[PDB]
Amino acid sequence: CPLMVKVLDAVRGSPAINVAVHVFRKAADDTWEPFASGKTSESGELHGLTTEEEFVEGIYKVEIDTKSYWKALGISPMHEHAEVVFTANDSGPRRYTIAAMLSPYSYSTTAVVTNP
Amino acid sequence: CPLMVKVLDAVRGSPAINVAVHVFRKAADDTWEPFASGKTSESGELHGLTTEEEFVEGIYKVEIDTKSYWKALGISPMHEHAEVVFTANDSGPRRYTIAAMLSPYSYSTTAVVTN
Amino acid sequence: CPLMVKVLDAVRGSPAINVAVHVFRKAADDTWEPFASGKTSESGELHGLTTEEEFVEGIYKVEIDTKSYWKALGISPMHEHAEVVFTANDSGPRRYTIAAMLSPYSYSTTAVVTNP
Amino acid sequence: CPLMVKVLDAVRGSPAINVAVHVFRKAADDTWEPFASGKTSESGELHGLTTEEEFVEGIYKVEIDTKSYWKALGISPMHEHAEVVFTANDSGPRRYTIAAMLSPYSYSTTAVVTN
Ligand SMILES: [Zn+2]
Ligand SMILES: [Zn+2]
Ligand SMILES: [Zn+2]
Ligand SMILES: [Zn+2]
Ligand SMILES: [Zn+2]
Ligand SMILES: [Zn+2]
Ligand SMILES: [Zn+2]
Ligand SMILES: [Zn+2]
Ligand SMILES: [Zn+2]
Ligand SMILES: [Zn+2]
Ligand SMILES: [Zn+2]
Ligand SMILES: [Zn+2]
Ligand SMILES: [Zn+2]
Ligand SMILES: [Zn+2]
Ligand SMILES: [Zn+2]
């Protein structure tokens, strides 16, 4: 996959499963244009989002739905999404894994970028 | 402070000092409206961004400029900013510290919400 | 303080308050010698652990008690402590703030080292 | 694998490849007894460390060698190792992935426990 997203639940020590992910690309008018979406698998991963030929150099935003994810805990999170913005392919095509460790009021987002 | 931003440099083990921070609020048309701005202090902290008159419930973005912060390392980072979006005051007036521990290809963040 | 420890609760979005912290220094027999301890304040901070005189060059471990912190939560954490080992003052005195953002199955430990 | 270790480099945005990992288990006299070891693969993963016959409930330390890892950075890190301690299996036989996301003066780690 040129772009894969992987989500892990730091509170329970598990992959975050069946979580909705939206990816946007910044367009010329500076709006975020929908680019791809899906739900994470059993392993927390969302594969098959895009193709090389769609994944052009640009600025992309990944939004992971968190509003309801934390409900059985009893906690409403800092925001309805966990978000990270990254710049892609600005030095030639690369593959990206965006890995997110999530808690209600903290997370990390790491971009693992490899030369295909 | 209703909103304070603290930025640490995870590569060097130091506050991120004199880094430009921009705060925006999501507007009615779904664009980011400029809300506040400043540079971090010697301690990595940015105080005095807003007041309760102005900081109503809504969706805010903290954007920290990182494009050249890394330059001396020799690393171009994953993006020219580090961001965090949070929803405020969804249940009354609450002081927020947004803490960001930054590296070029990973960053953590915390929202600490009190009072 | 030459050494300060600050603990944030990533699940609730708060300082972690009244949490016990232990600090050890690695002795010559390669056991961990007790060095200082305390409980964090309302800001999640623990000040006054040591003095410059006592805080000699060495390898230190900070252990933050987590076992029951996460009980009201309904979660057993990955370990009874969150722990961070660091090497101190090996290029002259420095002051250290050890900052931990904690969730039951993830945490981040950052050493902020400043030279007076 | 009953236990897998994955190591990412947050400074460069890459798996941490060919890094040495030791795993210890706390012994009866409170010292760390060597338990397993290996080097991460090109994906930053270390498989095959143990089996259920050997991986009983207890306290384990995963130690990743970092002293010279960011020497090319020009950075001496916060300690020559990055270390995570976890209590294993404490409720029956689980599979554990220990994921470490490293910078010289910070890291983010995580135990993913599945059944
Ligand atoms: Zn894939
Ligand atoms: Zn959604
Ligand atoms: Zn959002
Ligand atoms: Zn303030
Ligand atoms: Zn700017
Ligand atoms: Zn007003
Ligand atoms: Zn940006
Ligand atoms: Zn102090
Ligand atoms: Zn002295
Ligand atoms: Zn204790
Ligand atoms: Zn322990
Ligand atoms: Zn395996
Ligand atoms: Zn070794
Ligand atoms: Zn056996
Ligand atoms: Zn060590």
Side-chain angles (χ1 to χ4, degrees), chain C residues 87-101:
Chain C
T87 301
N89 310 131
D90 50 330
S91 316
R94 297 290 190 282
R95 314 193 312 246
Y96 293 79
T97 288
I98 301 306
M101 324 297 130

Side-chain angles (χ1 to χ4, degrees), chain A residues 32 59 76-81 83-87 90 105-111 113, chain B residues 32 59 76 78-81 83-88 90 105-111 113:
Chain A
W32 287 112
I59 298 316
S76 56
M78 62 191 281
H79 184 51
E80 52 266 30
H81 314 113
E83 260 109 351
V84 58
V85 177
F86 69 101
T87 301
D90 55 323
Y105 280 82
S106 190
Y107 59 92
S108 306
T109 51
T110 302
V113 183
Chain B
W32 290 116
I59 289 169
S76 168
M78 64 184 152
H79 182 53
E80 68 171 331
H81 313 112
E83 275 113 345
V84 201
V85 176
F86 71 96
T87 298
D90 46 354
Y105 278 84
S106 189
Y107 62 95
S108 293
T109 180
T110 306
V113 188

Side-chain angles (χ1 to χ4, degrees), chain C residues 34-108:
Chain C
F35 180 77
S37 67
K39 289 203 182 171
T40 55
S41 73
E42 310 236 93
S43 66
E45 294 175 9
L46 172 58
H47 293 266
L49 287 167
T50 188
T51 55
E52 194 288 321
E53 196 184 294
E54 294 164 35
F55 188 51
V56 300
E57 184 172 351
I59 298 155
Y60 290 83
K61 176 168 64 153
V62 171
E63 289 185 354
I64 295 158
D65 286 5
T66 48
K67 173 156 180 200
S68 283
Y69 189 73
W70 299 127
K71 196 189 317 196
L73 195 58
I75 321 230
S76 186
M78 55 186 268
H79 186 50
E80 55 187 340
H81 312 112
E83 307 196 11
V84 181
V85 177
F86 69 99
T87 301
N89 310 131
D90 50 330
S91 316
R94 297 290 190 282
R95 314 193 312 246
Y96 293 79
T97 288
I98 301 306
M101 324 297 130
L102 300 193
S103 303
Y105 281 85
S106 187
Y107 56 103
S108 324

